[PDB]
Amino acid sequence: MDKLGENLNKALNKLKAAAFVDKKLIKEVIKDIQRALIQADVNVKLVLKMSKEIERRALEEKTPKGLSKKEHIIKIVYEELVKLLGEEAKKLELNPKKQNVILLVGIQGSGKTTTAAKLARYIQKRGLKPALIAADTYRPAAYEQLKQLAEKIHVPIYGDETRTKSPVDIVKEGMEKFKKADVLIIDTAGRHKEEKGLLEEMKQIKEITNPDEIILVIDGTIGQQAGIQAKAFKEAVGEIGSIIVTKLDGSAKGGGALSAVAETKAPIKFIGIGEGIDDLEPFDPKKFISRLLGMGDLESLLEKAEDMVDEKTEESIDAIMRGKFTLNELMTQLEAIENMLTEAKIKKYKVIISSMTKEERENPKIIKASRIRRIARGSGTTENDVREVLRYYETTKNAIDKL
Amino acid sequence: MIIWPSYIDKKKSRREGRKVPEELAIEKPSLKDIEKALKKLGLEPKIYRDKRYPRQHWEICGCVEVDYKGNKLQLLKEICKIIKGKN
RNA sequence: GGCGGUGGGGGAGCAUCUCCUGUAGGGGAGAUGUAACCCCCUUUACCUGCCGAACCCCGCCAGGCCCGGAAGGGAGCAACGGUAGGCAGGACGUCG
């Protein structure tokens, strides 16, 4: 959960730069990147593959090939680790008009009755009017821990403490709260500790509504077992199912739980964090890892990885390319040091530049003293060597011009 | 030991390297100033006009090395006191 | 349509000071101040998107630089991510 992010980043850590990988140093990370995962109760078999797709990737076709050394493997791990926690499908649809119908379910001992309230205060902010309907029995405390909530919010709810039932104590509220209902969540999950029974009560009530989404409120704590629940759910819900895994703070195992729900194709659209409606963001893989691996997340590689293709497309991209530009020259030194301005003069120009701002490279007249001295100080060279780059530039630019 | 100008620069700040308090913190410390001080104190120092303190890696500030086996902190205090009183 | 974006508490961290310390880089311990990370309480003051001040704003620090014989450590610029702050929509609050 947090120890995973704890014992884990201790491997990306290992990757510094000192003694550039021979071709095995990667392994000294893998065995442990993985054990963080196993220890974080992830289905072993999932882990052993995870470990192989780094082999056949980063001690094979590897090569700084891309964003340089350590950066890469520290990238491969990521881009893959993520795919474990989920491909991507968090797009919780909303309401094509002004009326939808989400169905909540999930074995007893979960956060199902609460996750009700929470979701209500998700859509609230999404920009919609959600109402809840206690479509099952509740314990004489459950009323002291729900309504209150629906009161913490504007969410109206139809609860039955007098006489009770199901397929009508659900009909009325349906044909009742509509006078403002943009979205309607229905808390129906009977008190079942076992899935089969969960999926039967759930249907009697899928014939009375035409659900837009059925949601399964699983449970982190439940660790990898969460996924054998995900299957019986997907294998019974016409793909309108979506998991909600909560209690991601109450357990060492749990991150190992999403990976389970992640094997099953069934989509994960929300996650638990705590108890207060605040800490309850939608689930999006990449983000979860940013929180996880700490350090510099995903987008941190779309300028120094996007500007680098086969070099026969880039080396020649600039063949038609004529008009100058500082990122365009950077793009030329990046074909002079390589693919053969003395050496040392080629890396230093590329070094100085590599410390300017897009704004400064894009149409670079705005550069003067105060800035020069910051590029020239952030890069390790002298104010004079940055002026030589400017010079060089301002010369190649005058020169490069017509056809 | 090494003595970096920055230890005793009334202008620089603590994080930027100062070690003596505001009182003793000469304005514009020079190596001369430094060298000289340790001389009066019976030490035998050498200047390296061209070294740099990582904290201001971009500036050749130089340091002076002395072989002394005592507290550095109070040598430093020792050097500043001598410098504030200078004809 | 208009108009509006709330108070705080805890600790990490950061800035400035003070004290001890190691024959470099450094290391310990505190006071004060805080927006930035974590978590809670209050509130309509929150959402999604794009921007954000180059640097004397935070993190993160690739390279490059510095101290070191190395191990390692420093400062820190782009990028990236954020604050303060803005442009949109949307929803909440108001209409004084």
Domain harbouring A242, CATH code: 3.40.50.300
Neighboring chain B residues of A375 at a CB cutoff of 8 Å: none
Mark the nucleotides of strand C covered by protein, meaning any atom under 7 Å from a CB. Answer: 15-26, 38-41, 46-48, 52, 54-55, 59-68, 71-81, 90-92
- Same domain flag for A172 and A244: yes
Q: Is A373 on the interface with B (CB under 8 A)?
A: no
CATH topology of domain B1-87: Phenylalanyl-tRNA Synthetase; Chain B, domain 1 (3.30.56)
Neighboring chain B residues of A377 at a CB cutoff of 8 Å: 58
- Same domain flag for A121 and A262: yes
Chain B residue with Cα closest to A378? B58
- Same domain flag for A277 and A185: yes
- Distance of alpha carbon A217 from alpha carbon A112, whole angstroms: 6
Q: Tell me, what amino acid is at A62?
A: K
CATH number of the domain that residue A297 is part of: 1.20.120.140
Q: Does at least one atom of strand C sit less than 7 Å from the CB of A378?
A: yes
- Same domain flag for A222 and A107: yes
Cβ proximity of B76 and B3 under 8 Å: yes
DSSP A281: P
- Same domain flag for A293 and A321: no
Span CA (A303) to C1' (C78), Å: 11
A11: left (phi over 0), alpha (psi -120 to 50) or beta: alpha
What's the start-to-end Cα distance of chain B, in Å?
A: 28
- Same domain flag for A322 and A251: no
Q: How was this structure determined?
A: X-ray
Distances (CA, A) of A184 to A96, A125, A147: 13, 15, 16
State the resolution, in angstroms: 2.5
CA angle, B26 then B28 then B34, to 5°:
65
Burial of A276 (C-beta count, 10 Å sphere; 0-12/13-18/19+): exposed
- Same domain flag for A300 and A328: no
Cβ proximity of A101 and A155 under 8 Å: no
Instruction: Please list the helix, strand and coil fractions of chain A in percent, rounded to the nearest 5, in that order.
Output: 45, 10, 45
Q: Does at least one atom of strand C sit less than 7 Å from the CB of A375?
A: yes
- Distance of alpha carbon A265 from alpha carbon A242, whole angstroms: 10
- Same domain flag for A99 and A197: yes
A223: left (phi over 0), alpha (psi -120 to 50) or beta: left
Nearest to B70 by CA among B47, B46, B23, B38: B38
CATH number of the domain that residue A367 is part of: 1.10.260.30
- Same domain flag for A60 and A138: no
Q: Is B57 on the interface with A (CB under 8 A)?
A: yes
In the annotated binding site of A, the residues are 106-113, 187-191, 246-249
Phi, psi (degrees; rounded to nearest 5) at A216 = -105, 115
In order, the DSSP letters of A208-255 are SS--SEEEEEEEGGGGGGHHHHHHHHHTTS-S-EEEEEE-SSS-STTH
Closest nucleotide to A373 by C1' from CA: C55
Q: Does at least one atom of strand C sit less than 7 Å from the CB of A379?
A: yes
Tell me which residue has tokens 């520290």.
Answer: A74
Task: Tell me how many residue pairs between chain A and chain B have CB atoms under 8 A apart.
Answer: 3
- Same domain flag for A304 and A328: no
Number of domains into which chain A is organized: 3
Burial of A289 (C-beta count, 10 Å sphere; 0-12/13-18/19+): buried
Nearest to A10 by CA among A36, A40, A44: A36
Q: H or E element: which one contains B64?
A: strand B63-65
Neighboring chain A residues of B58 at a CB cutoff of 8 Å: 377, 380
- Same domain flag for A131 and A275: yes
Residue length, chain A?
403
Enumerate the H helices of A52-101 as residue ranges.
52-58, 69-85
Domain segments of chain B: what residues?
1-87
Pick out residues 215-244 of chain A having their CB under 7 A from any atom of nucleic acid strand C. none
- Same domain flag for A297 and A246: no
Q: Which domain holds residue A212?
A: 89-283
Q: Helices A226-234 and A195-204, interaxial angle, to 10°?
A: 30
Q: Is B58 on the interface with A (CB under 8 A)?
A: yes
